[PDB]
Ligand binder design. Sequence first.
Ligand SMILES: CCC(CC)O[C@@H]1C=C(C(=O)O)C[C@H](N)[C@H]1NC(C)=O
Ligand SMILES: CCC(CC)O[C@@H]1C=C(C(=O)O)C[C@H](N)[C@H]1NC(C)=O
Ligand SMILES: [Cl-]
Ligand SMILES: [Cl-]
Lengths: 470, 470
Amino acid sequence: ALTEKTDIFESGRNGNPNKDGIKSYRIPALLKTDKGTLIAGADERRLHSSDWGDIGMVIRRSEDNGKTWGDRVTITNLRDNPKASDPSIGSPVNIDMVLVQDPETKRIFSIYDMFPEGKGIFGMSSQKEEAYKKIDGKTYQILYREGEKGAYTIRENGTVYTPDGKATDYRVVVDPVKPAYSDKGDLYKGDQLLGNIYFTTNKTSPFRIAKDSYLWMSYSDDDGKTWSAPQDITPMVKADWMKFLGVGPGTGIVLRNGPHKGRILIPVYTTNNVSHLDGSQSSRVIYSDDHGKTWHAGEAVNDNRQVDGQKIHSSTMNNRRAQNTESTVVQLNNGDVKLFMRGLTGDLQVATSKDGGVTWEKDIKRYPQVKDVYVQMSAIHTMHEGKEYIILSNAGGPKRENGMVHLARVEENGELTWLKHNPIQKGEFAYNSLQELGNGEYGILYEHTEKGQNAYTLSFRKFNWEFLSK
Amino acid sequence: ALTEKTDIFESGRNGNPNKDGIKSYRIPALLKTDKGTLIAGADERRLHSSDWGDIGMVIRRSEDNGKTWGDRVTITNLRDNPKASDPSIGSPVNIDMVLVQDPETKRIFSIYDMFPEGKGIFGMSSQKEEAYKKIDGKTYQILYREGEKGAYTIRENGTVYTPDGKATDYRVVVDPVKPAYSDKGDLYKGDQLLGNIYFTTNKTSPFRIAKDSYLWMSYSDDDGKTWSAPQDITPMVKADWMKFLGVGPGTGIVLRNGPHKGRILIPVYTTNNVSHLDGSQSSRVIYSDDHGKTWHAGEAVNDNRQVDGQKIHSSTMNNRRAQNTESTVVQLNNGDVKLFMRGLTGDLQVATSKDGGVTWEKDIKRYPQVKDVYVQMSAIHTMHEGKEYIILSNAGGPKRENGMVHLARVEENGELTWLKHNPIQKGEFAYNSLQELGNGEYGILYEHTEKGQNAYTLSFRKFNWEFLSK
Ligand SMILES: CCC(CC)O[C@@H]1C=C(C(=O)O)C[C@H](N)[C@H]1NC(C)=O
Ligand SMILES: CCC(CC)O[C@@H]1C=C(C(=O)O)C[C@H](N)[C@H]1NC(C)=O
Ligand SMILES: [Cl-]
Ligand SMILES: [Cl-]
């Protein structure tokens, strides 16, 4: 009914790197593809377990439903700043992926955060630094030159233009070609490599991007074997007021029914400049109606939400307990979208959208039946014997421990009834990602440690309906 | 050399209404047209002197250079909410105008603030209420309905659409026809008047606009005699992060030389949601390059500005002393644009733009020769014999008192050499607006009180080069 665990990404032990030189893996995503392949994605956290440093976005593939797994494939690994004083914060950063496959095109997307060199989200400037400029209708990423106020721009072919609109002999590698695209952002003056636009300290080149928060996408058209260069989708979805915008990691969905069938939904969340991480973390989705070419931001759950008899908005709120952060998204057979959101009530919080994830109903539903210890979760739709269910996995508590799989019946009015709660992993348990495998089987990729393992080793189990019904 | 004062807009006395039932006039704008007409504009503040209540945007014309003045012409006067409990905050508000004429098309523009019913800027919602939505490429104003979360929209012909995009039987007066356009915003169902979308208390209709900050424009093609219905320019210029966006009142300019010649410049300022009126007031200009058809926001003087060794941005700043508010704008013969900004240094603060008002140099210049008591000022370019000068008028201080006219030589690099400082009005003295009359003559419209006049009576004096020079 429940398989023994298979370690997919193994961390080092007792604070040492593993044999591949990697201290930590974090942030699992699991995707069953049209070919039946399982793709397991993770942050490869080389130097330490924190949300910054030298991190690669990686996947492994299983062609036998999780029994065996191929070599690590690295999607993106930006090169470190070789002159950084603190290597622990010395690299441009990618973290936190969401995987999804388009069922019409078979294109597989990995969407993940990016920050320039520094302490990840904690490296963002304290005052806003504009990251893009719209010039004659085209959006260009901004560069700042040492000692100068003005916004240089990266235009076609990566040619750097002066704030006054004059082409220079500086060029940015906008079409990276090295393994894992480690050359992305490299800055050249003609033939000479000078540095990298993502470096923020001890620079050898004149130019850097804004110390802001970015969203990148990479895609695979060969079942996860090879991956595109990263696409910068930030300007499509990030409003000027947003401070952080980043993914709720795991596995997104494509709507399978209703007027918005085919729409791809990716959980994200934002902060504002009023209260940032103290009081404004707010869930929403971004979405594509054209198979991943263009993206749009849905409204926040928190936009025009009534909290304590007063309205809030994600752009202006400052309310610690009204926050909702990383989320997981499911569509019901009736077309409604449920967003299960990490939050600070101690129990499961759920928002509902009747318009394919663009706007949210006025009430967030809470379920005391399911504890939320403030950690990521995953949830998936499933049918069992003509009946509709949702399976949700997260930590049982009291801390990030005792992995649970929760089973809810989806009632005829779209409400949820929690029926079963079963342990899947004793001891440490954090982030996780669920997938249906077919024939009454489900798979999960999750964070756990034992035997001195560093946070975390990402392991895989399969379970069936008999496990769920216990 | 200096005429006696002529009262153009007369306030009441000792706290009472004047003979027309108007307590106060405020916020002068003076415009010398191509025909030679003088247009004097003001807020007609019926109920009291504050920046809210029942206020009309008015002008008077003089066809003989300030000797005689015609009847008051009301550009815009939104109707009050007849059901408001407190009539002093009981009307949708317009306040603060900027006048300018396009020298090519001769069209005259009046641009001014608008707020829905309440205490003016102090009636803005504490949390963001979205004011506009883009649907099918088109931008629509939002309406909120009592007890409903979703955004209704005002679409073609004023027809109200549901949040889910269905036409209702409700309609908004979007093309007002009553004198002074007092029917603007009226909410009808079929042919029955139900209320007004600008009303925010004790409503008789289901709908209101966002409690936000707006910018409206009215224009005249007949030398100020008649005026168009108000045009909502807000969505063209107001970023999502901006809380307040309003004009720096007085008289705007059209650039007369350089690559941007023809551009109309209107001083405005913003606040953000981080510190609002406490630490974020920030000057900039909005501009039109197509004779007032479309408008764009320039960058703030405060954007990426270095203050006490650290950068600020207008969208995130919280620095009382770094604020700059209402301003007056002048183009030099060398093409530079100077922005003289009301601020909190006690002396004259000046920003410079080399690109027609879009971006500003890193340093704000302070001129200790000119006191600034934290009050609006006006400034104009002038040629005399034929050397280039600026004339600037404000209060000499210590309070809002002792009107001064300041004369600067503009040097070839755009530096200002202050030559003369001449008193023009003893006693109370506040907002003002200068114009060149020709033949070495200049006219000014300013706020002053005497003999128990309520703030303010707006008066007009002419002076010549003889007065300026001693
Ligand atoms: C930014 C929100 C939160 C602050 C504690 O950090 C998240 C928490 C995490 C966690 O609770 O384990 C891991 C996430 N990968 C991280 N995200 C980022 C962007 O760093
Ligand atoms: C909003 C800035 C300030 C409040 C501190 O109010 C301004 C001050 C004024 C003043 O100092 O006399 C008059 C302006 N008409 C007013 N503007 C608005 C929009 O109300
Ligand atoms: Cl560099
Ligand atoms: Cl009403």
